[PDB]
């Protein structure tokens, strides 16, 4: 299956063939009540003192529990869970290029960041969110330092020379209508 | 940040004024360390650490949540192959004096987001703007050239002060004077 | 905009990345938020102890 | 007498907000609710619902 | 295409690096 699925597009094979071949299965929350579920193929299906030895299913990748905004967090597992929540929320406020045809749009408010960048540290699941095509942020050379107090309490000190070079520069479009 | 580390730009320094490494790599953003310990956003540090590896190895790093081939010793051993401190720390010269900072600053590339909440859409101020037609007090809102509410909670705080002339000014003379 | 190529989407001045799934209503993009509800046709049992009932079965 | 806010204006601020507005779920339970049992992260959201993406407000 | 090549010739390293499983900073559940 991995060999046929790696060679997709160059041949007609697809996800539905894993379904039709009986390899993967859609399991409802109400049916997930009855599965005996592994979390990696190998590591849970080896031979030790027994946990279950009656596994019925395996996870595809445990990072699929995450949503859209949460799956852009790098190392979410190294974070205090409320922090991931905050990011989940702020990630919806991040300026980027909001859609590809934005110069045809007359949307009432829009922000386009000048020089948006792809993340330098990405999750594997931010490929499918198409985040590397339409990113919302910049890789900044952050220091974590108590430099001269002005960052002291949830604040940050930015580089003026970087901002002069267009670092985090943006266009705010406002749009008006009348008939 | 990508980790729940919100903050306002507190000041902007030029590249002459920022701290600098043994080469002229000033930070783009400096965040106060006091953000990390209470919040336990370790993922931010790790990201800042891996981003450093990513920029020097010249290949985009992987931050999938539950990976276990990734840890901090492994990243650290990579980092140390490029001639950096294994822990991501560096030796900064102070931008004003030029003197080395006695603390080794944690520094590296991290992805930052600009949020839509720009100050120039929130700054507001009033003196004798428009009045509501019904009760002759200031309008609400920033766009309607409105006035701030001196609510009940504010009112209690002035009673507690015994600032009764101010109370009657905010509640009579600077609001809706009549005869 | 269905089964339609990147070339054609670009020629319509429309995004190939746009997911879909929303309505245009007076030139506004509208989404229907998926409202959750208790499942139909399925018996449940609860304790509304705050009443004449020790237990209530529901359908 | 109706349900409200079921249709909403699609959020065109960033791609990640577009994508996330289209996959949003909403609870019918009213506000002015002092009850927590509907606001809690249930064991059974695993893999179905993001255990991270929620509003920090009253919602 | 080279990421397919890169990722397959890389992840076999977790099968080849057989001698030294020792390092600490990672854990996993072992129930019952």
């Amino acid at each position: 299956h991995i060999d046929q699925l790696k060679e997709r597009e160059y041949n007609n094979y697809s996800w539905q063939d894993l379904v039709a071949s009986g390899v993967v299965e859609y399991i409802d929350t109400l049916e997930e009540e009855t599965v005996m579920l592994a979390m990696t193929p190998d590591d849970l299906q080896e031979k030790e003192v027994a946990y279950c030895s009656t596994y019925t299913h395996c996870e595809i990748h445990p990072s699929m529990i995450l949503g859209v905004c949460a799956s852009i967090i790098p190392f979410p597992d190294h974070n205090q869970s409320p922090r991931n929540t905050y990011q989940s929320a702020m990630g919806k406020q991040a300026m980027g290029v909001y859609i590809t045809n934005f110069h045809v749009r007359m949307d009432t408010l829009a922000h386009v960041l000048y020089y948006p960048q792809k993340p330098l540290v990405t999750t594997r699941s931010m490929e499918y969110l198409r985040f590397r095509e339409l990113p919302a942020g910049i890789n900044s050379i952050v220091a974590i330092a108590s430099y001269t107090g002005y960052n002291q309490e949830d604040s940050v000190i930015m580089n003026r020379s970087a901002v002069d070079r267009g670092f985090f520069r943006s266009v705010f479009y406002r749009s008006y209508k009348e008939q | 940040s990508r980790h729940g580390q919100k903050g306002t730009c507190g000041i902007q320094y030029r590249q002459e004024d920022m701290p600098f490494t043994c080469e002229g790599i000033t930070p783009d953003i400096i965040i106060n360390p006091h953000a990390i310990p209470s919040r336990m956003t370790i993922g931010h540090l790790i990201e800042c650490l891996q981003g450093k590896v990513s920029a020097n190895k010249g290949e985009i790093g992987d931050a999938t949540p539950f990976n276990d081939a990734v840890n901090v010793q492994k990243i650290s051993n990579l980092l140390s192959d490029y001639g950096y401190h294994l822990r991501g720390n560096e030796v900064l010269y102070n931008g004003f004096t030029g003197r080395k900072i006695t603390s080794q600053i944690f520094i590296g590339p991290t992805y930052y987001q600009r949020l839509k909440h720009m100050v120039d859409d929130k700054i507001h101020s009033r003196a004798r703007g428009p009045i509501q037609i019904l009760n002759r007090q200031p309008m609400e809102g920033r766009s309607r050239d409105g006035g701030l509410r001196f609510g009940e909670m504010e009112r209690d705080c002035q009673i507690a002060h015994g600032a009764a002339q101010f109370l009657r000014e905010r509640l009579f003379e600077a609001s809706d004077p009549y005869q | 905009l269905n089964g339609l190529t990147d070339r054609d989407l670009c020629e319509l001045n429309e995004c190939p990345l746009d997911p879909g799934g929303y309505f245009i209503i007076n030139g506004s993009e509208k989404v229907l938020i998926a409202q959750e509800k208790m499942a139909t046709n399925t018996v449940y049992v609860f304790a509304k102890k705050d009443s004449k009932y020790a237990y209530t079965g529901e359908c | 007498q109706a349900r409200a806010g079921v249709s909403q204006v699609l959020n065109r601020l960033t791609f990640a907000s577009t994508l996330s507005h289209l996959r949003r779920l909403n609870s019918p339970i009213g506000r002015d609710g002092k009850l927590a049992k509907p606001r809690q992260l249930h064991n059974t959201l695993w893999g179905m619902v993001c255990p991270a993406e929620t509003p920090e407000g009253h919602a | 295409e080279w990421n397919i090549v890169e990722s397959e010739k890389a992840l076999v390293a977790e099968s080849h690096n057989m001698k030294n499983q020792q390092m600490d900073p990672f854990t996993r559940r072992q129930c019952k």
């Binding site: 996800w15 990748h61 | - | - | 996959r23 | -």
Partner: peptide
Amino acid sequence: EITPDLWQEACWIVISSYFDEKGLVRQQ
């Protein structure tokens, strides 16, 4: 073959294909 310990490569191929077949908004 029934025993690939190549899995953090194989895994994301089934992910990619899920996402090629069904978009993100398929549910709508």
